[PDB]
Amino acid sequence: ELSTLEAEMAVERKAVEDQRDGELEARAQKLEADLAELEAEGAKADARRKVRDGGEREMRQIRDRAQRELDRLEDIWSTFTKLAPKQLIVDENLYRE
């Protein structure tokens, strides 16, 4: 069943990646839109820079969440492919998954 399971795995990875790109694109459009609003309503100096830093930080958060999940999946697949008797699984989540 190695081929089928590897395929389903790859599909799940792609699902996570597509979700990541969608969320990030959304946050980028929201960032540029909000900046356009701050420039539209009067203006400010450091406030636009600060809110830009906030948007960039949030995008970093989204990318890093999806990256942690991708590493989780990679770890599941590595653990199952090399799975052999006498091996110890110290993570409850990894064993349940």
Separation of alpha carbons 88 and 56, rounded Å: 40
For 68, the token pair is 């942690």
| Experimental method reported for this structure | X-ray
Sign of CA dihedral 87, 89, 94, 97: positive
Question: Do 71 and 17 form a contact (C-beta atoms < 8 A)?
Answer: no
Q: Is 43 left (phi over 0), alpha (psi -120 to 50) or beta?
A: beta
For 41, the token pair is 């309503």
What is the three-class DSSP state of 23? helix
Resolution of the structure, angstroms: 2.8
For 35, the token pair is 């900046």
Separation of alpha carbons 47 and 51, rounded Å: 6
